[PDB]
């Protein structure tokens, strides 16, 4: 039910909690509601908390045209200044890690401290990738998550489908973010980053490869490393405790 209006383009949000502002930015042809709920309720009891729905995604406007991650960013900053929120700690996931990564370069005074999750610089120096909509997100959880989070953990994967298939990206919009995804130009870039940063992911992560996280963090000038063991792409969620005690903890450290 709330909308904000960033260069004519009605932008889907939720905002909760109190305390210093926390920008989450979800991957490719995710929206809101793809955020682990336990996750993003628990930061809510020490931020405010700002997850939204992408351009193309959720119960945002579709715009058939190019994206691209500049374009991104651009939403994101918009979003905070209809929020009139200076400041913000960031932290994105997969794509919106390109997103975090194009915030962070171009954009240094609106970020008070960036998390980058399983993500890439992309280009050269990254490492790349190796029926019903129902089934579809059912075989999804194989590259998100091993075979023994899925055996252990299928009651809570299984509550999460419903909620993905009211707000479905339509498969124009999946190829635009798809395309978005090429147009990261950051990486001689990341050294000037000076924002706090905490990378992150799962070691077993099969989608981006983990060393991807070690690049990021060896280019940015003081980031912290965090790789969990027995998690993977999905480490927000088969991670959730042991990454909310150290998200939790770097935050504490930031300020806006």
């Not at 960013?73 to 918009?78: E, F, L, R």
Request: with cysteine.
């Amino acid at each position: 039910m709330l909308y904000a209006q960033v260069n004519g383009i009605n932008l889907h949000y939720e905002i909760e909690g109190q305390g210093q502002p926390l920008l989450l930015i979800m991957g490719l042809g995710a929206p809101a509601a793809a955020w682990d709920p336990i996750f993003v309720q628990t930061l809510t009891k020490t931020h405010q908390v700002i997850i939204y729905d992408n351009r193309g995604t959720g119960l945002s406007d579709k715009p058939d045209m190019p994206y691209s991650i500049a374009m991104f960013a651009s939403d994101a900053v918009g979003l905070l200044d209809a929020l009139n929120i200076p400041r913000a700690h960031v932290f994105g996931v997969s794509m919106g890690g390109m997103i975090a990564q194009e915030l962070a370069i171009h954009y240094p005074q609106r970020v008070a401290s960036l998390i980058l999750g399983c993500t890439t610089p992309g280009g050269k120096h990254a490492v790349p990738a190796p029926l019903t909509p129902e089934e579809a997100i059912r075989e999804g959880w194989k590259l998100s998550f091993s075979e023994e989070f899925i055996h252990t953990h299928k009651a809570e994967l299984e509550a999460h489908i419903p909620r993905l298939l009211a707000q479905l990206t339509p498969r124009f919009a999946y190829e635009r973010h798809f395309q978005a995804t090429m147009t990261l130009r950051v990486f001689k870039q990341l050294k000037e980053i000076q924002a706090p940063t905490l990378v992150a992911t799962g070691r077993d992560d099969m989608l981006i490869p983990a060393v991807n996280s070690e690049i990021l963090a060896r280019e940015i000038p003081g980031a912290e490393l965090a790789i969990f063991e027995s998690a993977g792409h999905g480490f927000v969620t088969s991670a959730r405790e042991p990454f909310l005690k150290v998200l939790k903890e770097f935050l504490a450290r930031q300020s806006v």
